[PDB]
Structures are given as structure tokens and as C-alpha cells.
Homo-oligomer: 151 residues x 6
Amino acid sequence: ANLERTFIAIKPDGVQRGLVGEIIKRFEQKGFRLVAMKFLRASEEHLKQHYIDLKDRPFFPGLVKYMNSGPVVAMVWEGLNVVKTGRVMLGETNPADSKPGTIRGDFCIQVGRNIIHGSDSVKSAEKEISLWFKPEELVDYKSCAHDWVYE
Amino acid sequence: ANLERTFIAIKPDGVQRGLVGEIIKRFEQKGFRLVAMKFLRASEEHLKQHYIDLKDRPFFPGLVKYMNSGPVVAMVWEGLNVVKTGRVMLGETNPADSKPGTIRGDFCIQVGRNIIHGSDSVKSAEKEISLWFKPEELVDYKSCAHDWVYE
Amino acid sequence: ANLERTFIAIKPDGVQRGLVGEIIKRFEQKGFRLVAMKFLRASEEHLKQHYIDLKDRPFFPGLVKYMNSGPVVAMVWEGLNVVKTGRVMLGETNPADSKPGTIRGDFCIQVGRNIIHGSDSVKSAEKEISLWFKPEELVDYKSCAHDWVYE
Amino acid sequence: ERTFIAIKPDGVQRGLVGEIIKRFEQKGFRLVAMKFLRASEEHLKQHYIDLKDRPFFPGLVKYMNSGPVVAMVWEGLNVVKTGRVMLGETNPADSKPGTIRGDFCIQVGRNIIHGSDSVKSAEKEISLWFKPEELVDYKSCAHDWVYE
Amino acid sequence: ANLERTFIAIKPDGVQRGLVGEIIKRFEQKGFRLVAMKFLRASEEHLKQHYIDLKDRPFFPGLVKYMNSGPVVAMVWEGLNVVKTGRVMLGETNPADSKPGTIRGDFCIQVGRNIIHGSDSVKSAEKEISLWFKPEELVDYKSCAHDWVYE
Amino acid sequence: ERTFIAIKPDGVQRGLVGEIIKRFEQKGFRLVAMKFLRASEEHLKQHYIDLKDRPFFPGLVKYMNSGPVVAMVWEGLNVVKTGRVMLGETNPADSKPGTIRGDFCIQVGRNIIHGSDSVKSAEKEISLWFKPEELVDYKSCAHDWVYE
């Protein structure tokens, strides 16, 4: 019995500005389940593969370089509609348009330094999860409060 | 109309997930006055009364059962437009639609486990207060900051 | 020993200064179980009974007036060593001696305005619970996290 | 860009100074200037000069002089417009949960905070409330992580 | 009456690490009254005046240079035993020895980067206040919760 | 220096991962490595090899395997000792308010977190739980504000 999953990465700026715990707490307190997590400096080639659909966009080389300029926190979270809801929690990709109460709305200013990534769709999420994690890094466990989050 | 009151109940899930203090802090920090509060397991019959308006709805049986499945924190809060503002603070009844920054937006996922109830109108508020509280349980006192919250 | 209980009251100053939610959160996050809670203005008659052991202290008259000067939040909390641990959480009865991280240490200054009471022993806790609550106001339920708080 | 933010007497009285500053700090804006004062009625009449002919102008000045305020200047990209977004709408009733006014107050006449409405007004307010030498220049250690 | 006052300065590291609001909130929530506050880069000669009792200690020269390396937030706070209690809230001057729950215990590591200063005596406080502030920068007002903080 | 910190299964289950990480970040320590896993019984037997002949050892391994843990490496000046001071005493009963155990748990057998007890223990734990390539070298933007 597996719910939907999404890929969330805290970008180098989110690590550098000391926001790792704050971000994780927002997912925990919502009732989502942490399925996987690792901390690494992703290679430029790995980042190009992650962002392959953006490869022709003028910002893509600077995006790859910045994403490689420090470590990221890569995560998989599980729950009902976690992909869409995760994006709502993160706020709009451009922080200018992110509302107060969202992660980007509370904590950052510019699109090129927008602290976090979340998958845009279930299919994107599955691709991203497979790119970043080995299957055995996805931990199956039951949340003690599951029956108080879900009917 | 600084004397308006609303009924707020923390549902069994909210209790079970450790959110009582967080929820009360949100109402205190906003400037609303706590008028009444108690902690109880509401009987089936009491809840049937409370939800008589929904009694011919498909989710009604399940709702009554969930609401009897642990204790609730029942409260009365006072202030200007507290009914409507209380509801904005809680977020949409359906957590899927509740925005980050709201109680449901921040803390829950599914409508059948939506942590909290607030009255939908002044008329419903007065009925709910009467059902859940004895008049002698309503405490009259003056907030020391009242003249800094209200002109 | 996991069934011990203690009586905690947030004093009139704790209510007036908007600390109810903060205080409850501290007990929730520690792992203790909320057994009972109500909000009331305690009568002089009632408070004389509560503070019976301090009846000949020079500060007793003033203490009784203060404690009747606004409502209090009365609570019962359950868990292993909750009486001793509750007092550690609260701090010393003089706030000036209470350490940062404690409730009194963080939030108040003077002994006469020391925001909170906790039972000093198991015997006094049982007396205080009986005085402030009817047995039917003590709610029995099991915390979903119980087996992760206790071995 | 720079904006003027003032925590009004009710914000100070209700113990929200730290909370409010933390919001601006955590967002990535740079604090440029800050002072705490009871603004004189004459200083406030200047601040509110556009309103001198309105019947509520005396009561407004009385209120704004009725306790101290924290006056600040913050710097960042779009900080004028974004500061307003962070404060919430001028009426707390319309301010969303997550905003300063939405989280912390109830009535338009006790709405805890002001921020400049435009770059124009900001430069006016900054010149009025601060001496140039009170605007401190420094670079945030996290600058390269807030801005590309 | 005028209660005791202390001088508190948030050092350039406190400002750079985004701790100004956190620090101010801890003094507000304790119940102390903010009397004066400004934000400035202090001159080396001003800083030598402030630390003149330490002028023969080997750390003194480096301390003056660091304190001039960015702006500070200078404050005056008032309340009962605010000098002594303020120092308890800050923690030991050496963060190595500062307890969790204190400002230095929670937020810093090394004595040369110890985020904050508080006066060590009432006489020191009066000297520091006069050094950093004009008499007219000290604001007299009455806290709305004063009678709930003090008997 | 570096230390090994693990959030135990009860800390994960009770929703304390973010809280705990924030405490280390806000102190000024640098996160060097982090992974989330159900540690295998053999892995845990190695971690607790000194206790293998004690009667409580099977129960301990069983508990530590009963849910996922967050394994971390943190760096900073005397981080081994100071990490232990931040966690509090090994019995939560004796842990003071403000510490992780003092704030968040009750019973010694459900004490939410481990930190290395010594620099030698830290080195052994880091080598057991992480590959060398999983220890990430970067410089904190605030480094010169945390250290002289």
C-alpha cells in the first residue's frame, strides 16, 4: 500500500543559509512520510540530466553551475497528492510571486537562488526519484500517526 | 462588534498529533480572547446533535465515529469578526484547498482528518457554544492589551 | 510508573500574557499525555483550599487575591515521573533562579507573577487533581506515539 | 532598493519587535538602519502631511505618538513591494495567514506595522526618519546565496 | 519608579548571522521593557572606551578590531534584576560553557565570535548606557502588561 | 573536529528530524554528511559490538532496527563534546530543558538521538556509517562570523 511520492531537493543556497531543518520540519508537520534522504554535491553531468528539459533555456548553464556550487539535500516524501501539495508548500518557483507562509515566500528573494526544488508531476517525480536514488535507499516503514492523518 | 464569539474544536487527530498548543498560540497571538475551554470525549449522541445538519450526507456516519474516537479540545474565542476570521485562520474545510500559513494548510492532508472545526456563522456559533458549554463556563475578563488591539 | 499524573495550572498572568499555547506545546512535545483541561476563574474559597499548606506564609493573602484576579487554565498531565519532570520544566518557583529553557526562566521575572504552578509531589498531585477536577473530567485514551515514547 | 518599515506603537506594546525583524532577516533582506523613539507630534505631522486636512488626522497623530515605534530601513531586490506583501493588506481582516498583519492583529486602526507604498515614498520616508550617517553599509555574508 | 537597566549589544556576528529578531524576542518574552535601540558601526576609539577595563588583557586588541568590522545593535532594557538576569539569559561569556537554552548556548561556538554583550554590573550598565546613548534616546513608556509581570 | 549524530527510530517516528537538524545548524556547526536508512541488524551489531555479549543486546539491536534512522556527520570546534551537551544526558530524566532530550523525550530506552562519546568513537562511527565520498567538503558562508 504505497501512496504518491515526490522528489524534493534543498538547493545549495538552502543548505548555506541554514534552512535544512526548517524545510524538513514543514514536511514532517504536514503529515508527509520521509522515504529517502541523502546529502551530496551532485556532479554537473548529473544536474544536466536532472534538468534536461531546460537545456535550451538561457538560464540552464548558470543553473547547473550554481546547483553544483555546494551540496544539496535530496529527499523523497510520500503522501496523498504530495507532488501538487509539495509544490503549493514550496510556493511559486519565482519567489517574487510566492506567498508568505510558503517556503520560498518566507525564505528567499530571487529565482536563481530559490532554495528548493520539487517535482512538477507524478511522472517527473518518478524520473527524478530514479535518477537520484537507488531503489534500496527508499525505506518502507509505517508512520505511527498514519491513522490520524488518513481515514 | 468586538464582542462576537466563535466555537473552535480541536478534533481527535489534532490532539493525537500534538497540535493543541500550536493551535491555541495562533489564536492568542492574533489578539483574540479565550472565553472558554474544556477537554472531553464527546458522546455519540452529543455529536449527532452537533452534526444534525449533515445527517443525510454520505460522510456523516464516518464523521460521528471519528469524532468520538478520542478527546477534543472545545473552545470559545472572542473578538471582532472572530467567526469569519477564525475560518480564514483554519483554512478551507478541505485541507487539499487550504493555503500554507493556515492551520489545515500547515498541518494536515485529508478532509476526514482535518484537525479542527470552527463555526461557519454567528448563528451556528451561538448554537455550538450552547451545546458544548454551560453558561457558567464562559469567562468574562478584559485582556491587558485590549486597547492596543482595538481602537 | 508511566501512569503518574501531575496538576499544572497556568496562572492569571500566563493567560493575560498570551502563553497558554506555548506552555501546552512544551508538555505535548516532551511526550506527556493531556488527561484533563478546563478554563475558569477559581473562587477565593477554592484557592484557600488549594494553597492550604501556605496558609501561614506572609504572602498567602496576596497569593489568594492574585490567583482570583483572572482565569486560569487547569490541567492534568500523565507520564513517567511527570511530577518531578514537570517541576524541572517549569523552573524554580522564583523566576530569577529559573534557568533559560524552562517556562519560568524564559517567560517571567518575579515570584508573585510566576505564570504557572505544578504539583510538588505525587501525593499533592493527587490532592490537587481531586480538588480541581471531577473524576469524569479525566479522559482515558492512548497516545499514537506511546510505543515510541516508552519501551 | 530600500524601503522604510515602522513597527507602530501597538506592535511594540504587544511584544512583536523580534518576531517582525526575524521575518525580514529570514527572507534575506539586509537591515540598513534602525532606531527606537517616540516620534514627536511635529515629526508625525510631517510623515502624514498628505492627510493633514482629514478629520481623523488628529487622532492618528495621537495614536502614533502614544508610544514608541521601531523605525527601520531594509534593502533588497523589490524590497518595497515584497515588504508590503510580507506585511499583508492594510486592513488586517483582509491580510492572509502567513503575513504579519494576518498572523498578529485584527483591526485596521491597530495594524502594528507600516511599510513604504512605493520607491518614491520610501525615499521620502527614509530622508525624514533617518540621517544619512544612520544608513549603515555592509555586505551580508550570505549575499552570494541570496542573489545570483 | 524606574527599574534597573542594562546595556545589551548584538555584536557584528549576531547581525551577520541573522539573529537580531531571535535575540530581541527572548528579552520581550521574558517581560523586560525595551528602552533604547540603535544600529551603527562603532568606531575603534568608541569600542576601546567601552572595553577599557579589559585594556590589559591579551584579547583586547583583537576584540576592538572585530567589534568595528560590522554594525552592532545597541539596546537598553529595563526590569527587575535585568543586569544579572540578562547575563544568565546570554549564557557564559565563553560559549564553550554556555548552557543549551541560553542565547550563546543555542547560537554560537567560540568566545571571539560570541554574538552578544551584556553589562556585568549595574555600575557598568550605567556607564555603558551613557557611553552609547544620548539621554533623550531613552524612552519612558509603560508596558501594557506591566501589572501582569510585577506585583 | 567531526562527530557522528544519529536520530534514532523514535526521533524519526515522533517527527523531530527537522527540529534536531535546526539545532545543529543554528549553533554554527557544519553538516558534513547525512543519509536516511533502516540500519541492518549486522550493521547495528557492529555499531554496538562492545555490547554484543550483554543480555540487553538483542533487544537493543531489535529497537534500533525497528524503524529508519537519520545518520549525520557535523563539524566544528569541540563538536564531539558540545554535541553531547546539546543532546543532554543519556537519561532524559537528567537532561535539562533546552537540550534535545530534555525538551523532547522521557525514558532512557526511547532517547531519540545518539552522539559520539569521544573523538575516537566519532572516527569509528563515521567510518562505519559513511563512505569517504559521502563526507562533503564545502565552506559555510558564515564561517568567518562563527570563528575568528
